[PDB]
């Protein structure tokens, strides 16, 4: 992540990120809504950072340093460029909504009142079709990526040295290869929990309550479609094992 955004989301909550004199100007229900919207954006910033560790530190480091057989890097990191494009674009829209809402003279005091429309746009139309296609593919290749990683780590010395080298820094403690894969698979099922809690604190403007209700239903439709579209791929599974599913 870039330093400007990391500092903007360093605090544990929106109520601790804004100036105390600005926090005092709002009602408790607004503070509760803004705290959950801040957690959605903060966790999205961290998710895009997970994807950059996968594309830049791991995938590109393996291509530029190791001599793995063709098709192996794509097997370890399926769909990572498509996932990075989806979420960097979504993060850009969330951060632009925050930046437009800043008070003149401040780089920290803002309130986002219209998130629902941005979530309906993200979870409908061509962007929802791309998220469905990409997660259906990624989640069906999740077991295969973990198995390929374990095999290379146990048998290839240069691969093991590379992984121990780039994962040694304390900032990578939670972000080994297998950990990144499961953080990405689990991201999509965090959205309903976050949206439902923002909706609980968004009743003050009826158009906003209606838009977040529409967004929650669109996210659950996407998750149901991804879940129905998954079948784990397995290296060496024969056609007979597949048609006897």
């Amino acid at each position: 992540s870039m330093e400007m955004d990391e500092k903007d989301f360093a605090a544990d909550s929106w109520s601790l990120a804004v100036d105390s004199s600005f926090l005092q100007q709002h009602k408790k229900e607004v503070m509760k809504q803004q705290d959950v919207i801040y957690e959605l954006i903060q966790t999205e910033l961290h998710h895009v950072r997970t994807l950059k560790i996968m594309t830049r530190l791991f995938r590109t480091g393996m291509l530029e340093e190791l001599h793995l057989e063709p098709g192996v890097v794509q097997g370890l990191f399926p769909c990572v460029d498509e996932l990075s494009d989806i979420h960097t674009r979504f993060l850009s829209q969330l951060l632009e909504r925050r930046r437009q809402a800043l008070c003149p003279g401040s780089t920290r005091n803002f309130v986002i009142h219209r998130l629902g429309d941005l979530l309906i746009s993200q979870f409908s139309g061509p962007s929802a079709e791309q998220m469905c296609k990409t997660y259906s593919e990624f989640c069906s290749r999740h077991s295969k990526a973990l198995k390929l990683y374990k095999e290379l780590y146990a048998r290839d010395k240069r691969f093991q040295q590379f992984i121990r080298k780039v994962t040694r820094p304390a900032v990578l403690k939670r972000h080994g290869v297998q950990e990144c894969i499961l953080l990405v698979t689990q991201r999509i099922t965090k959205y309903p929990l976050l949206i439902s809690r923002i909706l609980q604190h968004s009743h003050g403007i009826e158009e906003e309550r209606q838009d977040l209700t529409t967004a929650l239903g669109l996210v659950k439709e996407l998750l149901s479609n991804v879940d129905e579209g998954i079948y784990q791929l397995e290296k060496g599974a024969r056609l007979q094992e597949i048609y006897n599913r």
């Binding site: 601790l16 499961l182 099922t189 929990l193 991804v226 879940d227």
Partner: protein
């Protein structure tokens, strides 16, 4: 320090996310309680052995039967949670959660954990449950469920007060280290 993986499973109202948050911070949040938990790697020393224990939540996956099992590969210990303020959450343990965890995590130790133990003697909780002809889960009911399901053990805790939380994760570490 050897690395081990822990996954917590249970119904949406079992308190699993709050349990992971409180353990990972050694604090019940004073300003904001997070909605979600990403992951965490705890440094734990139990009985003289140092472990890095990776922690994972299954919250949000309860309705998605093909996404949820992607959380299970290479798990070393399962925390199977229910809330003491919810006999319904305990009823879903033996024939929903247990057969799934035994299928995807064969031979992995399960610790059955009763969460929200501070609510066992809470008057508001007792009044609400009595309307459905219910009462908070008794400790013998938790132990008998653990015994029935083949759990490694039964433990109780309160994420609100932190009582029992350190003990649950130290025991999960010990279970993860066993042959």
């Amino acid at each position: 320090a050897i690395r081990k993986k822990l996954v917590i499973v249970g119904d949406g109202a079992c308190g699993k996310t709050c349990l992971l948050i409180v353990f990972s911070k050694d604090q019940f949040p004073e300003v904001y309680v997070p909605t979600v938990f990403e992951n965490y790697v705890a440094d734990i020393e139990v009985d003289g052995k140092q472990v890095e224990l990776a922690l994972w939540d299954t919250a949000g996956q309860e309705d998605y039967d093909r996404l949820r099992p992607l959380s299970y590969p290479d798990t070393d210990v399962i925390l199977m949670c229910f809330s003491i303020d919810s006999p319904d959450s305990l009823e879903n343990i033996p024939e929903k959660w247990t057969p799934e965890v035994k299928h995807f995590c064969p031979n992995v130790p399960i610790i059955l954990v009763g969460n929200k133990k501070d609510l066992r003697n809470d008057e508001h909780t007792r009044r609400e449950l009595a309307k459905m002809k219910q009462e908070p889960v008794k400790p013998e009911e938790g132990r008998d469920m653990a015994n029935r399901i083949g759990a490694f053990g039964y433990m109780e805790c309160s994420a609100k007060t932190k009582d029992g939380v350190r003990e649950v994760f130290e025991m999960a570490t010990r279970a993860a280290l066993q042959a």
